[PDB]
């Protein structure tokens, strides 16, 4: 009747988790692939999309650390620090 969506599988194959464990602020994959948007994994990376300019990858520990790391300021989305766009 209703088909269910498949779960998330860590890119390194260490676990299979529902998609509510993806960016849920807890590290579930040894490669950090379930948390690309948070500071939860010690070896993850956050993508600075930097729309219009060169994209950059930063350490997960720099997501919501109160420091402006991406020129587009998207790494600071719930820290109190409001980053200005400095990509130009």
């Amino acid at each position: 009747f209703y088909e269910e969506s498949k779960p998330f599988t860590c890119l390194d194959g260490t676990a299979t988790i529902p998609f509510d464990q993806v960016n849920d602020d807890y590290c579930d994959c040894k490669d950090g692939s379930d948390e690309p948007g948070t500071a939860a994994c010690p070896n993850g990376s956050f993508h600075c999309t930097n729309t219009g300019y060169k994209p950059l990858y930063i350490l997960s520990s720099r997501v919501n650390d109160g420091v402006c790391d991406c020129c587009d300021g998207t790494d600071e989305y719930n820290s109190g620090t409001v980053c200005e766009n400095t990509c130009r």
């Binding site: 602020d25 807890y26 010690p42 520990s61 720099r62 109160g66």
Partner: protein, 857 residues
């Protein structure tokens, strides 16, 4: 070290006079007909049988099992010094009652017992007992010596020279001394600062331990020479009891230790002032810590950033160098809270100034460090360049606030700025002036993220005797430098700390590192062991030195990581980072002539070991912060000798290659080049220890030979404890101070554990002025982990939550249930390793401010 620049006991005329008195029948006798007893004190005249000089003994019982003995002249030519500003309150007294009396003896009961004091009239003696147990005797070897003040004007008693420096000594010989016997005691500790063993050595065949704040260039190890600070507190430990002696005297003091069924005798010999001594009768070492803290206060609660990693050298070149160092930490993923600016940052060593080429825009540099959530520390020393264009000098000269010579002129010595004068920090108006100089309007270029380093505050005087101030220089009230020497540095520390509190309107907690110190210095910030050397034995001596400081209330201690003098080989630098990472004050510092040693300059293997040490320290910041909160509240040391936790284990009494942090972590840092293992002593009958890296359980008591590599830091968590960690290591502690916690539960053999956690905003006095903080107690027993309030007065709005629980020594449960008020019952997923019995509880998700329980079904 050049030993000819510092006096031996024989070269200090008062030490030579005092020490020449040998054991025998005391010529002092109490005149029992003069005895007066009130609710607060007993007073009685003492007389020297030959000279007929009359002294007054003021004997007091005190609350919390202490006794105070004060001896002064009955009719002096002029008043003798009494140490001010060290005691935090007038100690509450306990009434003495006469329970026995005869023609040569009076037996006094303290309050309703069990403590008693026997005063013997001839020869004068005091005996302190608990019921029938003799704890301590005073003047048992007849070494009491009170040189009365003679008519102002044998060898060296009056005018005295040391090298080319003449001491005019207007008041002549005025030294005071007294001996104490400790029956049953074989082990004594404290009286810092000495580069020597934790367990103090007998001084019989050599020099006494010296307490005289001095700047000793290239100081050497395992000797009793006076170093930069002086805490006249001695602790005595045995299997049966703990005792302490606090000799409240600010003058040059020499301490003799002799051993003799076992007994240790202690003798104190001071240049001037009165005899003022506190006997802290314990009985446990924790009771002595509380006793001492009731007198001189507790460790100031460090702002959280100051428990992070500090990067220093003499000197970072300019703003560009500071910013490259800052960027270097982030480019190499190494956390750092603070970058330090040594004396080359100022305009020609005029303090409170900036070199206009090196630091033209200090506020801009501070704003850049603030964007990285980091701090800066600037050196401010208590010597002021003699320069009419320098505003600080003009104001201090104009208001007469400098230390003077006998002819009334401002003393001028030589230091970093060439000719310099010394502000009189004993004068309260000078301390007020100094504190106001830290206002953001007065210290131009400073900001709320600039903190301070007080150095050379012994005071160091390059052309003075022993590299310090002349003995006959004059201070506030007419007191000589000889009277106040050992509190000069404490006053600099106190006024700088007050300056940092004041500039913020009383909101921000200070951070001040001081070189010189005294009893009470724990109230003003941190200390460090000065100019150490880049050598393995100096890495090893950092433990006994900071332990000797912890025992006497100075919990915020450390040594320069890498050593100050010379170039450490990369393996030594790694091992020093690992030692420093587990010590209270964690700073890398280096002398002017050294090669650069920022940790990313080394080969990748060494960088990796250093990053690991840094990550370990940063993850433990909640634990460090809680230990410091307990030091602040109770007066208990952060860093502890093993005998403090194992008082009946006689094999721990001299251990100084190992130490504990609270009751939970045992640290044995690698301290030898080429070591492939370490011998770790794990004490405690019916105690278990977990290797924090491997989770391997080890039963006490045992000596384990543990294998090590370059990256190893031998650390064990005690069963029965819960350690909180921030597992998300970021670039600085401000970045991490709102992050979730991981609780590490190490189960005892009874399947239990406890631990506390202190949290607040990380830097203000709101915890005390508004009770804005949390003190949680985590406790485990049976199959339940509970969080409850350890102090219901404390509330804090915080996003901090419990993200994980790691339980060591647990079996695999069938189910994990979390309960908390206002939420439905939760089921947690878990992972379990059957080989190590390690259970990981996934994402509890609960606020650290809430009560909760986790039941293992």
């Amino acid at each position: 070290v050049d030993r000819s620049n510092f006096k031996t006991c024989d070269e200090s005329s008062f030490c030579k006079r005092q020490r020449s008195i040998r054991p025998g029948l005391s010529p002092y006798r109490a005149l029992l007909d003069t005895l007066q007893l009130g609710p607060d004190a007993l007073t009685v005249h003492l007389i020297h049988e030959v000279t007929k000089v009359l002294l007054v003994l003021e004997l007091q019982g005190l609350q919390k099992n202490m006794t105070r003995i004060r001896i002064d002249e009955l009719e002096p030519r002029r008043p003798r010094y009494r140490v001010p500003d060290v005691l935090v309150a007038d100690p509450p007294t306990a009434r003495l009652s006469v329970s026995g009396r005869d023609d040569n003896s009076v037996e006094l009961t303290v309050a309703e017992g069990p403590y008693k004091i026997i005063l013997t009239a001839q020869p004068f003696r005091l005996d302190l007992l608990e019921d029938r147990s003799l704890l301590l005797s005073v003047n048992a070897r007849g070494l009491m010596a009170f040189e009365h003040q003679r008519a102002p004007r044998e060898p060296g008693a009056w005018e005295e020279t040391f090298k080319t420096h003449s001491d005019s000594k207007p008041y002549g010989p005025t030294s005071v001394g007294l001996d104490f016997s400790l029956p049953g005691m074989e082990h004594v500790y404290g009286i810092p600062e000495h580069a020597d063993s934790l367990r103090l050595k007998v001084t019989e065949g050599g020099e006494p331990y010296r307490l005289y704040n001095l700047d000793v260039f290239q100081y050497e190890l395992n000797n009793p020479m006076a170093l930069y600070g002086s805490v006249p507190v001695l602790l005595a430990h045995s299997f049966h009891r703990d005792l302490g002696i606090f000799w409240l005297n600010a003058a040059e003091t020499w301490v003799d230790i002799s051993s003799n069924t076992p007994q240790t005798d202690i003798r104190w010999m001071s240049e001037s002032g009165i005899i003022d001594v506190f006997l802290m009768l314990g009985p446990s070492v924790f009771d002595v810590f509380r006793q001492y803290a009731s007198l001189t206060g507790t460790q100031a609660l460090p702002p959280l950033f100051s428990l992070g990693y500090h990067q220093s050298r003499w000197n970072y070149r300019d703003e560009a160098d500071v910013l490259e160092v800052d960027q270097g930490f982030d480019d190499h993923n190494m956390p750092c809270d603070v970058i330090w600016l040594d004396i080359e940052h100022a305009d020609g060593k005029r303090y409170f100034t900036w070199d206009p080429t090196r630091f033209p825009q200090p506020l801009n540099m501070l704003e850049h460090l603030a964007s990285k959530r980091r701090k800066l520390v600037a050196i401010v020393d208590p010597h002021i360049k003699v320069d009419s264009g320098y505003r600080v000098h003009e104001e201090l000269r104009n208001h007469g606030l400098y230390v003077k010579t006998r002819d009334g002129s401002d003393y001028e010595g030589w230091c970093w700025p060439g000719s310099a004068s010394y502000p009189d920090f004993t004068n309260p108006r000078m301390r007020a002036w100094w504190s106001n100089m830290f206002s953001f309007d007065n210290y131009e270029g400073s900001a709320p993220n600039l903190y301070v380093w007080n150095d050379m505050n012994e005071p160091s005087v390059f052309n003075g005797p022993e590299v310090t101030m002349l003995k006959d220089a004059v201070h506030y009230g007419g007191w000589e430098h000889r009277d106040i020497h050992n509190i000069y540095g404490l006053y600099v520390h106190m006024a700088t700390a007050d300056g940092l509190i004041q500039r913020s309107g009383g909101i921000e907690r200070p951070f001040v590192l001081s070189r010189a110190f005294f009893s009470g210095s724990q109230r003003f910030g941190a200390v460090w062991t000065g100019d150490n050397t880049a050598e393995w034995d100096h890495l090893k001596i950092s433990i006994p030195m900071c332990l000797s400081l912890a025992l006497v209330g100075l919990s915020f201690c450390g040594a320069d990581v890498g050593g100050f003098f010379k170039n450490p080989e990369p393996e030594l630098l790694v091992r020093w980072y690992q030692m420093g990472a587990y010590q209270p004050f964690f700073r890398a510092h280096a002398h002017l002539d050294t090669g650069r040693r920022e940790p990313w300059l080394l080969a990748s293997q060494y960088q990796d070991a250093i990053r690991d040490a840094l990550f370990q320290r940063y993850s433990l910041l909640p634990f460090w912060y809680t230990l410091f909160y307990q030091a602040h509240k109770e007066g208990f040391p952060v860093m502890r000798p093993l005998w403090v936790q194992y008082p009946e284990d006689m094999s721990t009494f001299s251990i100084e290659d190992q130490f504990m942090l609270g009751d939970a972590l045992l640290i044995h840092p690698v301290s030898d080049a080429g070591a492939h293992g370490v011998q770790v002593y794990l004490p405690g009958q019916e105690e278990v220890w977990y290797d924090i890296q491997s989770y391997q359980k080890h039963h006490g008591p045992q000596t384990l030979y543990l294998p090590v590599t370059l990256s190893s830091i031998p650390v064990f968590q005690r069963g029965g404890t819960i350690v909180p960690r921030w597992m998300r290591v970021r670039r600085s502690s401000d970045c991490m101070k709102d992050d979730p916690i991981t609780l590490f539960v190490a189960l005892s053999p009874q399947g239990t554990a406890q631990g506390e956690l202190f949290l607040d905003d990380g830097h203000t006095f709101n915890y005390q002025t508004r009770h804005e903080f949390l003190l949680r107690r985590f406790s485990f027993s049976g199959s339940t982990l509970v969080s409850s309030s350890a102090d219901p007065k404390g509330h804090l709005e915080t996003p901090i939550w419990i993200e994980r629980v790691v339980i060591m020594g647990a079996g695999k449960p069938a189910a994990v249930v979390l309960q908390t008020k206002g939420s439905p019952e939760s089921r947690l997923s878990f992972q379990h390793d059957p080989e190590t019995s390690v259970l990981i509880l996934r994402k509890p998700g609960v606020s650290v401010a809430s009560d909760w329980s986790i039941h293992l079904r």
